[PDB]
């Protein structure tokens, strides 16, 4: 059975002011939360790093 397909609406709709206005707020909140979580993860990651070793050192 050949599965049916469709043309995604957002690929063929003229850009509108409503999309912009609403997705702007959604992206603002997404950016805020992502920035907070990424800052936490960045602090964790950098603090996880090892200490600098000597030159040509084994173990």
């Amino acid at each position: 059975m050949r599965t049916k397909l469709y043309n995604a609406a957002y690929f063929l709709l003229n850009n509108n002011e409503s999309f912009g206005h609403s997705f702007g707020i959604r992206l603002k909140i997404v950016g805020l939360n992502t920035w907070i979580v990424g800052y936490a993860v960045s602090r964790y990651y950098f603090s996880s790093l090892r200490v600098k070793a000597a030159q040509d050192e084994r173990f």
Binding site: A40, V41, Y44, S47, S48
Partner: protein, 93 residues
Amino acid sequence: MLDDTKYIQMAQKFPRNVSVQLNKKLFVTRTWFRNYYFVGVFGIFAYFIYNQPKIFAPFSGYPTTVAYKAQPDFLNDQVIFYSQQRQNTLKNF
């Protein structure tokens, strides 16, 4: 009051011998998707909560440490060690 007549009837009168066989494969597929989204998504948050304190507060997890003193042994070319137990504490603020 809401007219829950039909729902009341459904609750009062339900079959007590009707059951449906479950395709084991599809049940397993859904459950393992659930496990995928637990271990690999919520696992990140859980491990962060569990470990980040252990990264920023390490001194409280290793209570006792050891210290050494050494002396030479010339006639045998050896080194003699004396150990000592200490309470692992901050130093050089």
